[PDB]
Amino acid sequence: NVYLTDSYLKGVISFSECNALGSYIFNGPYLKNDYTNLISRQNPLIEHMNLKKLNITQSLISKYHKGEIKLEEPTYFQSLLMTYKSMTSSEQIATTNLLKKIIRRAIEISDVKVYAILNKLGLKDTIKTTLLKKLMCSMQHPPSWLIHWFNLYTKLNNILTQYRSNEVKNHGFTLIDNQTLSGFQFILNQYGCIVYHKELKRITVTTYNQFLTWKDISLSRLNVCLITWISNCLNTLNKSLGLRCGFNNVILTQLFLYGDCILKLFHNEGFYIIKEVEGFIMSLILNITEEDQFRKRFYNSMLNNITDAANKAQKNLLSRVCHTLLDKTVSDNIINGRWIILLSKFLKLIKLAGDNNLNNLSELYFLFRIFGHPMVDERQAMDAVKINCNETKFYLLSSLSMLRGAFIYRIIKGFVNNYNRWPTLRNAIVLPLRWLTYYKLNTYPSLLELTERDLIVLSGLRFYREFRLPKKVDLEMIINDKAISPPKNLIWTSFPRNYMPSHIQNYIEHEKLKFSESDKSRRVLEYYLRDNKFNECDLYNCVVNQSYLNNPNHVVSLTGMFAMQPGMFRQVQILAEKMIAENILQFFPESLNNYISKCSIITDLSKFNQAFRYETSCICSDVLDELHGVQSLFSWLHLTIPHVTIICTYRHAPPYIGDHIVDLNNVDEQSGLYRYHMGGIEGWCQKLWTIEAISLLDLISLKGKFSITALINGDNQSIDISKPIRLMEGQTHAQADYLLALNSLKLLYKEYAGIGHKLKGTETYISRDMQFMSKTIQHNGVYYPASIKKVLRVGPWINTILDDFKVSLESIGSLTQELEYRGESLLCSLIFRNVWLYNQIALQLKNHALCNNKLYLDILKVLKHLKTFFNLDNIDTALTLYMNLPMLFGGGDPNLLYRSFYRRTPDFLTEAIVHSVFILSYYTNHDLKDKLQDLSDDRLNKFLTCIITFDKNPNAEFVTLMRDPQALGSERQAKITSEINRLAVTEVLSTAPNKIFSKSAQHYTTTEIDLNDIMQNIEPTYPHGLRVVYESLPFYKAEKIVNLISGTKSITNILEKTSAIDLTDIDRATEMMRKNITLLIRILPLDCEILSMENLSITELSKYVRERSWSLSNIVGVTSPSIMYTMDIKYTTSTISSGIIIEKYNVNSLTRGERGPTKPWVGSSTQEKKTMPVYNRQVLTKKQRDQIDLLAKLDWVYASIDNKDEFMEELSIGTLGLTYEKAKKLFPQYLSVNYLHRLTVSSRPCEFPASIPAYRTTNYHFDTSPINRILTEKYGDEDIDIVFQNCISFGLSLMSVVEQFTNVCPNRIILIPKLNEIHLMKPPIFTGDVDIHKLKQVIQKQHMFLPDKISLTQYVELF
Amino acid sequence: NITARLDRIDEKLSEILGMLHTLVVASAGPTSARDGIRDAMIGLREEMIEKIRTEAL
Amino acid sequence: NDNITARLDRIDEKLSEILGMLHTLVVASAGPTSARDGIRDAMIGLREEMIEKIRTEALMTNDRLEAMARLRNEESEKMAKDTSDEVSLNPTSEKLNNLLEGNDSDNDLSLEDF
Amino acid sequence: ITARLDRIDEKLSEILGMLHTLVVASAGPTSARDGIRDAMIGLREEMIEKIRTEALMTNDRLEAMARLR
Amino acid sequence: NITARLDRIDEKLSEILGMLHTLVVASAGPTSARDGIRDAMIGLREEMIEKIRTE
Ligand SMILES: COc1cc(-c2cn(C[C@](O)(c3cc(C(C)(C)O)c(F)c(-c4ccc(F)cc4)n3)C(F)(F)F)nn2)cc2cccnc12
C-alpha cells in the first residue's frame, strides 16, 4: 500500500493550493486576499502543518519574520532557475562528459539502423558508417547552452527521483536538500515545495505540480536544444538530412531568457502576454502568405491584442498584490510602463527566430509550451464566465424562425439525400402549395432557389419519431477513469474536513447515512461498480419519464475549465450527445468581369457555451427530440442548468458558508459560487452547438448570396466564401477579395448578434486563401509542420502506469517518430530516439522507483547472454545490439524498420524477423542487395534456428487468437499489461456490489474456456474470422470493460477508496517487467541442426513459426510478406520490364516542401463489395446494424461450415432475437469471393499510407503494369498475400529517404519483387463443425451484455 | 387571379404559422420545465405515449 | 365579382397587419430575475417597447447601446470600429510599433536591474 | 362561398385580438397591469383538447403499426 | 378548386388559433393557473390511460 507520485505534470498548477500553503507558512495573504488564505490560516491542513513544523522551515520563517529574506512569487524562482549558471569546474566537467557519452552512445546505436538502411538501398571502431563518423566529428563538443539545459534538467530530475524513491519507500517523506542545486534550498513534498535562495535572500512557497512544471520546462528546453543541435549538425553535413527548419541556438536561448524575464517582471498574469505569442507568429506567417490589406489588418489587430493583454495583466497584478505579502515585489518597470521596451525586444527576437521563413515560423509554435503553464485561478475564471453567462439576450422572432427553418431544411435535405424520403410530418398542412409538391415528390429545392420566406415557412413543421432510443444502456460509453461530482447534498465532501465549519461537518456526517454508497463514490467507475440497484434500462426509463428535470440533486462542479455533474445527469449528458453522433451528424457532413471572389473567415468558437441560451438552442434541439420521439432530451441543459448552483469544488477553494447554512442552494453568492447560469457549459452539447452553427452558416449564405463551405474543427471554425461579381474597371483581384471579406464579416457579425452572440474582433479574422485547420500550416499545397511541438516531452518514463518500461519505450518511439512522419527527417528522429532510449535504459533504469535496480540487473543479465550468444566483443556492443532488436523478441528497438517506409502492416512477425535480419547483417557482414546464403558468420543462422526450433506449449489458442489475431503463443511473445492484470481485474470485479459486473466476472474464466471450445474443430484456422466470431458475442463488451479497468493503477484498491498502489500490484508489475526483460534470454538459448539460408523465404519461416507456436496445422490470412525485404531496389533502366516504377514528375533536384502535379496517395485501401438489402434502416439502432453487419460477415466467411444452419440460427436467435431466415433478409450480400483480403475488422489496417506527408506523395508517379502482368501470368487472377498499397507506399517513402541520404532525389526507382516471398491466397473451405452448445453457453453466461433484441413490432416496421 | 390571391393568402398564413410555432418552441423555456407545463406547449410524443399505453394494460 | 375581390382585399389587409406585427416581435431571454432570487419567463414584446424596456433597465444586461443599435438596425460605434477598412492602433500598440520598427539596437534595455 | 370568407375574416379578427392580448400580457406589470395577472378569457381547455387530439393521433399511429403483428 | 383552398385555410386558421391560445394562457403568472394546467395534464394522462385500455 505505497504512494507513487507523478514524474510529469499530469494536472494543473493550482493557484488556490499555493495561496493556502504560502499564507499558512507566512501567516498572511500570499497570492490573493481571498477566503482561501483566511481558512488556511484559521483552520490549517495536516500536510501544511507538517511542512511548516520542520526545523529548516522554522529557521526560514524566523529569518523572514525579522526579516532578512524576501518573499516572492513562484515565477521569480522559475526565472532564477532557468538561468542558473553557477556550475563549478567539477560539475562542468561531469555534465560535459555525461552529455558526450550519451551523444556517442546514441550515434553508435543509430549506426546499426543507418548501416541497415544504406545497405538495403545500396547507397555505398564502433561506427562503421562514414556519414555518422563525420556526424560524430561534428558532435564531439557540445555547445554551452545545451550543456546548461542538460545540467539543469539532470539536477532537477535527480531531486525528483530522490524524492519519489524515498517517498515510495517511506510514506510522508519530505525531501530537504541544498547540495545538488548550488545556492538553492528545496523542501519538496507531494503537497508543497518551499524554495529558498540564500545568496539573494529570497523565498517562495509553491506546490509539487510547480516543481514538476519546472522539470518539464527544463526538459522541453533541453529537447529543443538537442533537436536544434542535431538538425544543425546534420544540415551542415547535408542540407536534406536534418529538419526543414534551420534554427540558431543562441537566439533561442535569448528567447527563453527574455520570456522568463517577462514572466518575472509581470507576475503569473504575465502568461497572458505569452498567450498572445501565436498572434505575433501568425502575423509573421501572413507577411509571407498574404496581400497588403489582409496582412496589415491582422498585424494591427495583433498589436492591439498584445498591448491590451499587457495592460490587462498589469491592472490585474496591481489590483491583486494590493494587500498581499507580495505588494513590495512589483517591479518599478511595471509602474512606469517601461515594460513596453522589454516586450518589444522579445518580439524582435521571435522575428529573428522566424528569419522570414515559413519553416521556422511554423516550428516556432513550441514557444507556448517551453515557458510553463500559468498558475490558474479558478474563482476568477468562473466569475469571468458568469459575467457573460447571466446576460439577457434579445432575439428577433424572425431571426429565430429563420435559424430553426435552416436547421429543419438541413434535416430534410439530409433525409432526402440519405433515406430518399421526407421525414413523416404530423402537420404537413402548413406547406402552402409548392412545399406540398416538394413533399409529395420527395425532392428539395437547391440553396440558390431558396428564400427567407421559405425558411420561415419551414420553421413551422413538426415531425414524427424517426429514430430509435436504445433501451439497454451501453456500458462502454458511461464508464471511464474520470472523477464524478458528488450529489448536491454531499458536495461539501469535495473540500477538506478542516476547511469546513462544524455545522457543515455534522451535516455531512448526518447526510452520508441517507445516501446510497453509489452516490458517495467520487469516481465514475466506483459510482457504477458500487451500484447495487443497477438496471440495464434505467437510463431509458429516466429519459422517457424525464427524471432529470427539477431534480434536487443536480449540481455543477468546476475543477481543473472542467465541469462535472453528479451521476445520472452525466449519463444523460452523454446519451443525448451519443444520439447526435449517430442519427444527426449524417445530415451535417461538414461538422467533422464575371470574376469569382473568394475569402476565408476563421472564428474562435470556444465562446459558444456562454452565448447560447434556451431560446436559440431549443429551436433545433426540439426538432431533434421530435425526430427521436423523446421530450426534452437534447435540450436538457438549458432546462436543468438554470436551477442548479454552479460551484468551484476545487480542494483548496472552499466557499464561505454562512452560519447555520447547510444547503448549497441557500449559500450566499460570492466569488467561487454563483447561480442562475443561463447558458451552456463548455464541452456539454458541443455537437448540438456545432450543428446549430452550421445551420446558421447556411442561413447566412442564403442571406448573403454567396456560396459557402464550413469546417468546424472543435472550438474553431473556418468559413470559405465565394461570390461571383461584376468586376469594376481598374479594380484588381485583391481589392475585390478584401471587399467581399469585409462585407461577409459585417453580415455574419450582424447575424451572430442576431442570435445574441456578440462576436469580438479579437476572435474572428479574415484570410484570402490560406487554411490553418488541424493546427497545421499549409501554403500553396505545401505542409509546414510543428513537429518539435510534439517531441518536447520525450523523457524516460513518459505516458506510462507504474513507471512501466516497455510502455515508456513505446511512447518514446511513437513521439520521436513525429520528426520522421511530419518533420521529414529519418536520421534526426532516429538519433533523438536513440539519445532518449539510451538515457532511459542505460542510465535511468537503475533509478526505478519500485524496483530500484532489479531491472538494471536483469538488463545486465540479458547483455551478458547476448555477448555469449552472438560472440560480441563486450557489453557495450551487447547494449548496442540489444537496442536494435525488435520488442517482439528483445525489447530494445520500439520502431521497426518498416515504419520508416510505410505506416501500417498486417503481419508484425514478418516485419520483426526482417528487421532482425537487417540488424544482424551489421555484425555478420552480409550483403542485403543479394540473396540469402550460408556464409562463414552464422550469427543469423543461429538466430533463425533459435526462432524456429522451440518447445511448443499451446494453451487457450483460440481465445488468444480472437483477442490478438497476430499473437504468437507458446510463451514466445512478451505479455502485455492487460493480459497480466486480467485475472486480478476479474477477482476484484467478482466482489463488486453490482450484480451485472459481479455475475459477468464470476463466469469470466468458464466463459473463456467455452469460447476456446467453440471453434476448435475448424481445420484451416482463420484468426480474423475468429475475431469476427468474437465481436459478434457479448463477451467482447465484457472484455473491453475489463481491459479498460486493467489499465488503471492500483487495481486492488479500486473499491478501497484510496489513491495508493497496493503492494500486490507493485509486485505483479515488477515481475511482469522482469519477465519481459528476460524474454530475450528465453527466446535465444545458448544451446540452440542449423537452418540453411539456401532458398529461404522469410514468409514461409514466419508462417511456420506462427503455426508451431500454437501447434495449429494451418493458419491462414494473417501472414503477409515484408515489402521492404520482398522488393529489391534498382535505380537504372529496367532492362527486364519487371517491378514497380516510381518516377519523379517534379523538375527540381530536391522535392521536399514542394507539391507536384499528381494526386495525393492517401493509401487507398480497397474495400469490400456488398449489396445492401432495402428496408427501413432507421428502425434499427447503431448496435443492431453493427451486429447485422458482423453476422453477414460471418455468413460470407463461414459459408463452408458443415453446420452453418444451426450455428447461425443459434447466433441470430441469441443476439438479434430473430430466426436465421428472418435476419437473412437484412444481411448484406458480399458479391466478393475472397474474404481473406476484403474482410474488414478492427484487426486489419484500414489504410496503408506512406511514411511521408500526403502532399509529398504528389511529387511522384507510380506505375505497376509490368509487375501486375507478371503476377497475373504466374497466378492467373488470384489474390496474393503481398499488399499492393504497401508496395506503392514503400516506393514513395524510399524515394523520399534516398533524397534525404543522397541530397539528390532519384530520377526513377524500380521495385523488383522476390517471387518466392509471394504466395497465393485463396479462400479455403472451412471443414469442421461449430460447437453449438458451447456457443449457447457463451451467449447465456454473458447475456447481460447482449445487444438490443429486434422486437416483433420493430421487425414489422422494418419491412 | 382568384386562385393566385388564394395562394398568396395561403403562403402568408404559412409564414404566420411558422413564426407562431417558433414562438411556441422558444417560449417553452426552463420556467415551464420548473412549472411542469412544458408538455402543454410541446405535446405528448411517441415515447411517453408508448410508456402510458404500456402502463394502460 | 367586385364583392369577392373586396372580401379578399380585407382578408389580405388583416394578414398584412398580422405579419407586420409579428415580423417586428422581439423575444427576451429567460434570464435571472431582479435581486437574483428566482428565474424569469421568456417575455416577448414589440421592437420599440423592448428597446424602451432596455432603456428603463427593466431587463438586466451587461450592454445597452449595442442591443439598442442592433434592434434599431443601427450601426453602433463598437460595430463600426470592429470591422472597418483599417484597424486603428491602440496608443500602446502604437508605441510598440515604433519600437518594433527601426530595429537598431538602441532600445536602452537593462536586464540586470530587473 | 362568401360565408367561408366571412368566417375566415372573423377568425382573423380573433387572431388579431389574441396576438395583441398576448403582447400586452407579455409586456409585464407596471405598464398595463392593475390586478395580479388577470386572466383575459379564462379558457385553458383549448390546448388541453388540442394536446389530447395530437396524442390521440400519435397513439393511433403507434397502435396501427402494432396491429400488423 | 376554391373549396379545397378554403378548407386548407380553415385548417391553418384552426392551428393558428390553437397555438395562440397555448401561448396566451401559457403566459399566466399566478400559481393558480400553473397548478390548474398541471392538474389538467394529469387528468388528461389518466383519461388517455382509460381510453387506451377501454378495448
Ligand atoms: C487487408 O488485408 C490484407 C490484404 C492483402 C492484399 C493483397 N493484395 C494484392 C492483390 O491480391 C493482388 C492481386 C493480383 C492478381 C490478382 C494476381 O493480379 C496482383 F497482381 C497484385 C499485385 C500486382 C502488382 C503489384 F505490384 C502488387 C500487387 N495484387 C489484390 F489487389 F487483388 F488484393 N491486396 N490486398 C493481403 C493480406 C495478407 C494477410 C493479411 N491481410 C491481408
Swiss-Prot record, chain A:
Task: State the active site.
Answer: H1237
Signal peptide positions on this chain: none
Gene Ontology, cellular component aspect = host cell cytoplasm; virion component
Q: Where is this region: GDP polyribonucleotidyltransferase?
A: 872-1359
Membrane spanning segments where? none
- Carries keyword Acetylation? no
Main subcellular location: virion
User: EC annotation?
Assistant: 2.7.7.48, 3.6.1.-, 2.7.7.88, 2.1.1.375
Cofactor(s) for this protein? Answer: Mg(2+)
Comment on bound cofactor: For RNA-directed RNA polymerase activity. Mn(2+) can stimulate de novo initiation but it is inefficient at supporting elongation of de novo initiated RNA.
Q: Where in the cell is it found?
A: Virion; Host cytoplasm
Reaction(s) catalysed by this chain, per the record, are:
RNA(n) + a ribonucleoside 5'-triphosphate = RNA(n+1) + diphosphate; GTP + H2O = GDP + phosphate + H(+); a 5'-end triphospho-adenylyl-adenylyl-cytidylyl-adenosine in mRNA + GDP + H(+) = a 5'-end (5'-triphosphoguanosine)-adenylyl-adenylyl-cytidylyl-adenosine in mRNA + diphosphate; a 5'-end (5'-triphosphoguanosine)-adenylyl-adenylyl-cytidylyl-adenosine in mRNA + 2 S-adenosyl-L-methionine = a 5'-end (N(7)-methyl 5'-triphosphoguanosine)-(2'-O-methyladenylyl)-adenylyl-cytidylyl-adenosine in mRNA + 2 S-adenosyl-L-homocysteine + H(+)
Q: What is known of its domains?
A: Contains an RNA-dependent RNA polymerase (RdRp) domain, a polyribonucleotidyl transferase (PRNTase or capping) domain and a methyltransferase (MTase) domain.
> In UniProt terms, what function does this protein have?
Responsible for RNA synthesis (replicase and transcriptase), cap addition, and cap methylation. Also performs the polyadenylation of subgenomic mRNAs by a stuttering mechanism at a slipery stop site present at the end of viral genes. The template is composed of the viral RNA tightly encapsidated by the nucleoprotein (N). The viral polymerase binds to the genomic RNA at two different sites in the 3' leader promoter thereby initiating either genome replication or mRNA transcription.
- Record-given protein name: RNA-directed RNA polymerase L
What's the source species for this entry? Human respiratory syncytial virus A (strain A2)
Gene giving rise to this polypeptide: L
Section of the entire sequence shown: 11 to 1460 of 2165
From Swiss-Prot, chain B:
S-S bridge residues: none
Q: Please, which domain of life does this record's source organism belong to?
A: Viruses
**What's the PTM story here?**
Constitutively phosphorylated by host.
- Record region (Oligomerization and binding to RNA-directed RNA polymerase L): 1-31
Compartmental location: Virion; Host cytoplasm
Q: Indicate the quaternary assembly.
A: Homotetramer. Interacts with protein M2-1; the interaction between the two tetramers is required for the anti-termination and elongation transcriptional activities of protein M2-1. Interacts with host phosphatase PP1; this interaction recruits PP1 to the inclusion bodies. Formation of a complex PP1/M2-1/P allows P to target host PP1 phosphatase to the M2-1 substrate. Interacts (via C-terminus) with the nucleoprotein N (via N-terminus); the phosphorylated phosphoprotein P binds to N-RNA complex. Interacts (via N-terminus) with the monomeric RNA-free nucleoprotein N.
Role according to the record: Plays critical roles in regulating RNA replication and transcription through its interactions with multiple proteins. Tethers the RNA-directed RNA polymerase L to the nucleoprotein-RNA complex. Recruits the M2-1 protein, a processivity factor that is required for efficient transcription of viral RNA. Acts as a chaperone for neo-synthesized nucleoprotein by forming an N-P complex that preserves N in a monomeric and RNA-free state and prevents the association of nascent N with host cell RNAs. Recruits the host phosphatase PP1 to inclusion bodies to regulate viral transcription.
Family stated for the protein in its record: Belongs to the pneumoviridae phosphoprotein P family.
Domain remark from Swiss-Prot or TrEMBL: The N-terminus is important for viral particle assembly. The oligomerization region is central. The C-terminus part contains binding regions for the RNA-directed RNA polymerase L and the nucleoprotein.
What protein is this chain from? Phosphoprotein
Lineage of the species this protein comes from:
Viruses, Riboviria, Orthornavirae, Negarnaviricota, Haploviricotina
Gene name of this polypeptide: P
Q: Which residues of the full protein are shown?
A: 130 to 186 of 241
